[PDB]
Amino acid sequence: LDPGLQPGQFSADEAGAQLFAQSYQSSAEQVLFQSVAASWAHDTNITAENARRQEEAALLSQEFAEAWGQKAKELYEPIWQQFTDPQLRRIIGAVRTLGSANLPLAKRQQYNALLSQMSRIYSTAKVCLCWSLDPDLTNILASSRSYAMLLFAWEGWHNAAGIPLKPLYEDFTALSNEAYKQDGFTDTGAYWRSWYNSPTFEDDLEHLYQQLEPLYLNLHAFVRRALHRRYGDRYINLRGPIPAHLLGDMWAQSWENIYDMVVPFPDKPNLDVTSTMLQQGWQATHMFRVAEEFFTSLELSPMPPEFWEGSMLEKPADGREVVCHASAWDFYNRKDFRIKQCTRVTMDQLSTVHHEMGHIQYYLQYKDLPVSLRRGANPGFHEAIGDVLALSVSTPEHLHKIGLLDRVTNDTESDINYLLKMALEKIAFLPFGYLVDQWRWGVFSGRTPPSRYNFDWWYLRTKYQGICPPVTRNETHFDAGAKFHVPNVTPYIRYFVSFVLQFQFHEALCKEAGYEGPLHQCDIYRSTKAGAKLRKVLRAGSSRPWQEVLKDMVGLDALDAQPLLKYFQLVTQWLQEQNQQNGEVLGWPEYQWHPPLPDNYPEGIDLVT
């Protein structure tokens, strides 16, 4: 470790911890910057050499974290928890957690290499006869309504990404648990859960899911019916799980892309404004500037020049390999902040632009916190910020204000269309956002050994989402591996928490804004009072317990499903009424059912390609 980056000495009391924390800060930003810059260089340009450089940056990071971690322990192990400065305790608490820096050098190099090769496997996989995930497979899952085309993209992707990840994923799991066990955690999953600082976290989440499950079951039954009328009885079983490739999305995780097949009242205004965006010639640039302008309408910060100069806002045309999966980047120098997105001109992509910009906004607002506290109050708060604004943006009235929806209507049919569309996006995602980390928590705990990765993945997929793989799978397949966050080692339960929390946020901001109609017709655009209430959250970083931040924001100190249930209530009732009238079976009691192959599959793919 460079002499300038090493910890000096400090007294072993709270006054010394403060100076220790201050000293840490100046060197930490340098080390984080070097590591984020190296990750940037690799992910906007995947080469063997950028991976080597990123690996060396990561090793430096581990070195730094071991030296300051061990010094914090040496000086403050018996006492940090009794510090009266609460922010100080949080800082030390962080520094003293070593993670992968617990491993010996050789295992740290194994770990860093595994992260790099798992990433490269996922981001460079392709399906031949060659398509990329982004844009090619994405566009197909979204837009194609051909059974065989969808199947070829689904199977190709899962086979191409998942199969080779499996041996690496095994080795990564063992090394990750080895590292965090030295921090005191029974497994890495227990470390990830600790961020919520809640002893009844898992029971609380199960309780949430129980209240939400009936909305998902009724939405599932209604979409299953629409798919049945289009694909017929051979490929859709009105009492069985839905084939996992027909829902608009590679992971079936949100269903917005099939809205055009399930829209209840077609002669109402068309709420998918993609065609209008294209017709009007929108590009990436316009999308980010319109999101930006929402944030400044609230008197939040604009994106700085460095964001505009450095971001990657479209997939590069030189065909260099990039990680297309959208992401928001804090360089830790309080100046560089960027988004890396292979933006496509589509309505769901306008939301993803808002999603990523919500991360940027948090980073802008907390940049002056001590480095350890530049995080959301919990990970689910970071995930909710952009989605809350996107809730206002998607409303018909808002879209009318930004030229994206010429016709205006306010009737019970138009409401149902909008709430249904919103339900495809938000409700359909619930089981998937809940299940992913159940699977990974079982893998980290050893309950799911490698001999059951796929079995236990499809157990949970059918249990919660009521889908089934459209070709047979066995334990040579690693279908969890074909989802970004798994090889990328990004936790998922944050997105389940976010999907509840954002409705709590929306409710509170809309009330603060002075709005007084139906929750799902609220637009907080240009509300400077909503803006101020949101800014208090963002500015807090992780300096304070998330329960208390939440309580100051919305008036309650817990996750609560009531705001989501209230926003969706008109369509929740309507879906239940429609499924009753059609005689539907709620759920999938034919749990073993899987569709047949299409005749002449895959031989005839060239006919529909």
Ligand X SMILES: *[C@@H]1O[C@H](CO[C@@H]2O[C@@H](C)[C@@H](O)[C@@H](O)[C@@H]2O)[C@@H](O[C@@H]2O[C@H](CO)[C@@H](O)[C@H](O)[C@H]2NC(C)=O)[C@H](O)[C@H]1NC(C)=O
Ligand Y SMILES: *[C@@H]1O[C@H](CO)[C@@H](O[C@@H]2O[C@H](CO)[C@@H](O)[C@H](O)[C@H]2NC(C)=O)[C@H](O)[C@H]1NC(C)=O
Catalytic annotation, residues: 356, 485
Return phi, psi of residue 324, to 5°.
-75, -30
Query: Closer CB to ligand A1IJW, residue 35 or residue 579?
Result: 35
Residue 383 annotated as part of some ligand binding site: yes
Give the SS3 label for residue 467: strand
- Considering only 134, 383, 479, 512, the residue that binds Zn ion (CB under 5 A) is 383
In angstroms, give the least distance from the CB of 395 to ligand X. Answer: 8
Would you count residue 518 as binding ligand X (CB under 6 A)? yes
The 8 Å CB, 24+ separation contacts for 12-18 are 12/75, 12/76, 12/79, 13/79, 14/79, 14/83, 14/84, 14/85, 14/88, 16/75, 17/75, 17/76, 17/80, 17/83, 17/88, 17/92, 18/85, 18/88
Backbone dihedral region for residue 281 (phi beyond 0: left; psi -120 to 50: alpha; all else: beta): left
Would you count residue 409 as binding ligand X (CB under 6 A)? no
Query: Closer CB to Mg ion, residue 198 or residue 346?
Result: 346
Would you count residue 116 as binding ligand Y (CB under 6 A)? no
Structure tokens of 481? Answer: 């591996």
Would you count residue 451 as binding ligand NAG (CB under 6 A)? no
Structure tokens of 92? Answer: 């030390």
Query: Closer CB to Cl ion, residue 140 or residue 435?
Result: 435
Would you count residue 240 as binding Cl ion (CB under 5 A)? no
Decide if 61 contacts 35 (C-beta within 8 A). Answer: yes
Query: Closer CB to ligand A1IJW, residue 235 or residue 492?
Result: 492
Q: Backbone breaks in the chain (C–N > 2.5 Å) follow which residues?
A: 129
DSSP symbols for 265-304: -TTS----THHHHHHTT--HHHHHHHHHHHHHHTT-PPPP
Instruction: Report the site for Mg ion in 328-357 (rule: CB under 5 A).
Output: 348
Residue 355 annotated as part of some ligand binding site: yes
In angstroms, give the least distance from the CB of 254 to Mg ion. Answer: 6
Would you count residue 425 as binding Mg ion (CB under 5 A)? no
Give the SS3 label for residue 188: helix
Residue 178 annotated as part of some ligand binding site: no
In angstroms, give the least distance from the CB of 472 to ligand NAG. Answer: 6
Q: Cα separation of 376 and 94, whole Å?
A: 14
Residue 245 annotated as part of some ligand binding site: no
Residue 520 annotated as part of some ligand binding site: no
Number of residue whose CB is nearest ligand A1IJW: 327
Cis? peptide before 104, omega within 30° of 0: no
Contact map string, positions 24 to 63, toward ligand Y, x by CB under 6 A: ---------------------x-x-xx-------------
Would you count residue 490 as binding ligand A1IJW (CB under 6 A)? yes
Q: Which stretch binds ligand A1IJW (CB under 6 A): 56-64, 352-360, 412-420, 581-589?
A: 352-360
Residues in binding site for chloride: 196, 494
Interacting residues toward ligand Y by CB under 6 A: 45, 47, 49-50, 320
Residue list, annotated binding site: 196, 355, 359, 383, 494
- Interface contacts to ligand X, rule CB under 6 A: 397, 410, 516-518, 521
**Known binding site for Zn(2+): residues?**
355, 359, 383
